[model samples]
Each structure stands twice: as C-alpha cells, then as structure tokens.
Target: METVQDCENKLPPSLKSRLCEIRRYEIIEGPEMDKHIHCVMRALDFVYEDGRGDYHKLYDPLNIIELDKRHDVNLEKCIGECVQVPTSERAHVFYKCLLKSTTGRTFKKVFDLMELKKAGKVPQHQRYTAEFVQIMKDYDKALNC
Candidate 1:
C-alpha cells in the first residue's frame, strides 16, 4: 500500500533508480484477476497486447528466474546461518558470485570478499590487505573502462 515516493525516499540515490523501475513494473503490469479467480491464480504478465501487439519493454523473465534461483541457492549455502556481515564484506561476496557465476569482473571480486566477511569466514581487518585492496581497485578501474 506504500506509494512509490515513500519507498524511493528510503533507498540510497544509487539504488533508487533500480527500485523505481521495479515499482513501475509492479504497478502497471501486475495481474488483475477476476474476484472469483483471484484466490486461485495470481498472474500478472507485464507483457500485454492492446489489440496492436504492442508489449511493454520489461526485464527478461528468464533472466529474472535464473538470478532468483541462483541467489536462493548461493545465499542459502554461503550465508544462510550468519546473522550479519560487515557491509563491505557482504558486497565482496556478492560481486564474487557475479563474476564467477553470472559474469566475470574484477569489480565483483570486492563484493565476493564482502560476502565472505559477512559469512564470518573472514576478518574485517583483512579488507585492508594490499592484495585485497588491489583486486578491488583493479576491478573498479576495469569496470569503468
């Protein structure tokens, strides 16, 4: 029931655009089943035709499904039991997975490291290690290029 503005206000500037994009999809593309069938089926296809075969330019369903499945399994296996991980470490682990499982990237290594730290398998102080820092920096530069 929350408005889009309300949600956007709570997110960081960097992440607000992505959240807004998702919100637009939910509002405009969400299913509107008849009252009788609402309880039995919850179908909201973003792709709809207005008798002209025009479709909404939306995120790919296959990509969404794949990412969801991957995250569910990976997060369960790696950080399922951890209560909390340092933010940097959490980011490290995520990037690591992105590089290894989804797309290889130097920037992702930083996230992978963060993920490991979040899992409690690594120490926060280790974030400053020369090798670790260099990897992250290297990836940062590579990503920009």
Candidate 2:
C-alpha cells in the first residue's frame, strides 16, 4: 500500500539527483509541461543529455545482481547479453525509449508497459528497445497522417 511519492522518497540521494538532473534537462530542451509530469519521465534517459546536461551512468550491471536476488528474478538471464549489470542502470534506457516513443502507438505501448510493471503484471526486466521501436513505427505512421 505504498504511495508513489513514498516509493520515490525511498530512492537513494544519488538516484534522486539523477532524476532531478533529467527533469531539469527536459524543461530546458523539451516541451514545457507541468512540474509533476516532468518528474515522471525526465530522468528516463539518464545516459543522454536533453538540455540541463548529462552525467555518467550512476549504476553498473554488477549492482543488479543483488536486485535480481531480491526480486527472485534473474535479470541477466532474462535480458541475455543486453543485461545491465546494475538493474538500476536499465532505468534510464527504459525511460529514454519511453520518452522517444511518446506520441502515437509507441506512446501507448510504452505507457502500457510501464503500467504493467507498476501493476506487478510484468517484470521491469521484460521491457526492451525492440518493443519500443515497434511502437515508434506505429507512432510514425500516425504522424504521417
């Protein structure tokens, strides 16, 4: 019964910083939105700078080993060679793709994936760029209309 804010409050300071940095970057570079929406997706692309700037990857794949143990799911095995050593590292990638795909079919797909993960129906590890691209293509098709 944890609220999203409560879950966010539990994040490490460094992770929070990354999230903030992304949020600031998005405001400077992307379309303007209310503050609340920005926080939801800004730090998603942790690897790339939007406008505020960019920083190095905060977590390594090795860090994910512990997460896998805790989640009772082998992320490395699930993602294969693309596995992020630190499971947290995947956060930015998924975030980036979600943002990139936001607009049309991909937008809904990414949102749905996120929703599913949040709802505990799909493991976060199951999300990937392949599905994102497929959605993006759908988004593009709509855009051409």
How close is every model to the real structure, measured as TM-score?
A: 0.21, 0.25
lDDT of 1 by residue, 16-66 (tens): 445434322222111211111111111121111211100121122222323
So what's the TM-score on candidate 1? 0.21
Off by over 4 Å in 1: 1-71, 78-85, 102-144
Off by over 4 Å in 2: 11-86, 102-145
Candidates in order have lDDT scores of: 0.31, 0.35
The superposed Cα distance between candidate 1 and the true structure at residue 142, in angstroms, equals: 14
Each model's total of backbone clashes: 14, 7
Which RMSD values do the candidates have, in order?
A: 18.4, 14.0
On residues 1-145, what C-alpha lDDT tens digit does candidate 2 reach at each position? 3323443454555454444443222322222222223234333322322222122221222233222232212222222322342333333333433343212233334444453455464577755357754654464344341
User: Candidate 1 — worst ten consecutive residues by lDDT sum?
Assistant: 46-55
